Subunit: 70 residues, 2 copies
């Protein structure tokens, strides 16, 4: 077992007070942060708006990098 658990570092609550603590913390706990269906959509990405000199190395290290990074 290698999960990181909640620790009551001080105090010794009764099982009712444990239940109250858990129901509060569990309903306070954040919802679906970092959502599972964050689609990719590169339409109009800011890197395509920039002017690049025809020989600008940022055409490799910014533009192509940004399109191809997955």
């Amino acid at each position: 077992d290698h999960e990181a658990h909640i620790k009551v570092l001080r105090g010794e609550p009764t099982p009712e007070e444990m239940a109250a603590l858990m129901a509060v913390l569990a309903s306070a706990g954040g919802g679906p942060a970092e959502p599972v269906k964050k689609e990719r959509n590169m339409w109009g990405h800011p890197v395509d708006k920039l002017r690049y000199s025809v020989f600008s190395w940022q055409r490799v290290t910014l533009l192509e990098r940004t399109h191809m990074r997955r």
Copy 2:
């Protein structure tokens, strides 16, 4: 060190020499002012092509075509 016209057989008289050269000089048609023409890259074909975002032709065709002078 210039390359001169040569006549290889027979000798024309000065009159025939003048007529020969005069007609050849008349045949020297052309622009009357041969010099390096004005550069205008507007709408050059290489800008019209689709290049993959990682296509090496973005270096060896598109960029070299724009930058070459």
